[PDB]
Amino acid sequence: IKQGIREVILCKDQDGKIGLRLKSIDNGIFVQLVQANSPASLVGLRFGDQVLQINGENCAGWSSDKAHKVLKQAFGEKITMTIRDRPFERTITMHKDSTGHVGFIFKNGKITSIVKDSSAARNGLLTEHNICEINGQNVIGLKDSQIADILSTSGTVVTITIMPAFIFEHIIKRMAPSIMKSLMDHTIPEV
């Protein structure tokens, strides 16, 4: 998680899209959805990113509808954006035991127990937190089984990005479970 504020420059694609859904939380605007292969994905916008500004206008206090309106009505040629990196999220690093476990249970991507003397316990992993990313890959909307499978196919070192459950439930309100599984960018970062 980068500790402050960066500028990003988007271009609407050929259908006039940037591949973003924004959401109002606590008088800020946050990324609720990034579409795969979107101008939003190419410049590296992530679920939980805070949009401080669009084209130099402060987003403070905007409704989600006004944020989408401002975007729709923008000279697609070139949109600038000031971004704070997933301010609600934290990153935890764990190591698999010889049995290949980091040491937690989860249901709907929300961690509900920490196993005793697990890596999860040693690095202070918490319950009532949703898994957003594993090793930089967004897993939101994937089946539990499929998240389980990604933790298998990661190495012995597993970095998880997490978010308090209440904050996660507030961000994803009014988006069908089909959109998150099917249209949320789940790609491995690109170099």
191 occurs within a structural domain:
no
Distance, in Å, from the CA atom of 46 to the CA atom of 99, rounded to the nearest integer, reads 32
Range of the domain at 165: 90-183
Q: Which amino acid is at 113?
A: S
Do 71 and 132 have their domain in common?
A: no
Tokens of 17: 């899209």
29 occurs within a structural domain:
yes
Q: Which of 84, 108, 139 is the last residue of a domain?
A: 84
Entry field: residues in the chain: 191
Q: State the binding site.
A: 108, 143-144
Residues with Cβ within 8 Å of residue 99, at least 6 apart in sequence: none
C-alpha angle 31-28-36 in degrees, rounded to nearest 5? 5
Do 12 and 50 have their domain in common?
A: yes
Q: Which of 25, 49, 84 is the last residue of a domain?
A: 84
146 occurs within a structural domain:
yes
Do 95 and 33 have their domain in common?
A: no
The 10 Å CB-count burial string (b at 16+, else e) for 152-184 is: eeeeeebebbbbebebbebbbeebeeeebeebb
190 occurs within a structural domain:
no
Total of domains in the chain: 2
CB 35 within 8 A of CB 41: yes
Do 114 and 177 have their domain in common?
A: yes
How far from chain centre, in Å, is Cα 23? 13
Do 66 and 100 have their domain in common?
A: no
Do 103 and 47 have their domain in common?
A: no
Q: Which of 45, 67, 84 is the last residue of a domain?
A: 84
Sign of the C-alpha dihedral computed for residues 162, 166, 170 and 173 taken in this order? positive
CB 185 within 8 A of CB 38: yes
Distance, in Å, from the CA atom of 37 to the CA atom of 33, rounded to the nearest integer, reads 13
Do 101 and 138 have their domain in common?
A: yes
Q: Which amino acid is at 126?
A: L
The CATH code of the domain that includes 107 is 2.30.42.10
Do 158 and 128 have their domain in common?
A: yes
Q: Residue 37 — left, alpha, or beta (φ > 0 → left; ψ -120 to 50 → alpha)?
A: left
- 173, 174, 176, 181: CA torsion to nearest 10: -50
DSSP string, the chain: ---SEEEEEE---TTS---EEEEEETTEEEEEEEBTTSHHHHTT--TT-EEEEETTEE-TT--HHHHHHHHHTS-TT-EEEEEE--TT-EEEEEE--TTS--SEEEETTEEEEE-TTSHHHHTT--SSEEEEEETTEE-TTS-HHHHHHHHHHS-SEEEEEEEEHHHHHHHHTTS-HHHHHHHB-------
Distance, in Å, from the CA atom of 168 to the CA atom of 146, rounded to the nearest integer, reads 19
Bridge pairing between strands 129-134 and 137-138: antiparallel
Residues with Cβ within 8 Å of residue 123, at least 6 apart in sequence: 92, 93, 94
Q: Residue 22 — left, alpha, or beta (φ > 0 → left; ψ -120 to 50 → alpha)?
A: beta
133 occurs within a structural domain:
yes
65 occurs within a structural domain:
yes
188 occurs within a structural domain:
no
